[PDB]
């Protein structure tokens, strides 16, 4: 119930902050998937999956937009997992981008 709102503007900068969450040793893989594609995910296992270069894992688990567009507009969900692989953090952001 409660996810969250933000607001940003098209064509410029904005990160997905996500409630109550860090990206510390104990968290092992942090995937960043909306509706039904990948926007980032970082395994500790290397080899992690980059949407594109419009975006960039924060040091804290976080997601750094280049440049805000109509399909950065909706809904993200983060699902952070820990070493032993399991769940740790499950949540749900609302971005708005101004057009
Ligand atoms: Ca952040």
Known sequence: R?????????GHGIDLDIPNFQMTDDIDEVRWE???????????????????????????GDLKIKNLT??????????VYSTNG??????????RILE
């Not at 909306?34 to 804290?60: C, H």
């Not at 399991?86 to 971005?95: E, S």
């Open 2 to 10: 409660d996810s969250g709102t933000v607001w940003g503007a098209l």
């Open 34 to 60: 909306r509706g039904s594609t990948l926007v980032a995910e970082f395994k500790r296992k290397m080899k992690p999956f980059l949407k594109s270069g419009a975006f960039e894992i924060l040091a804290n």
């Open 70 to 79: 109509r399909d950065d507009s909706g809904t993200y969900n983060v699902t």
């Open 86 to 95: 399991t769940r740790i953090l499950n949540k749900a952001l609302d971005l």
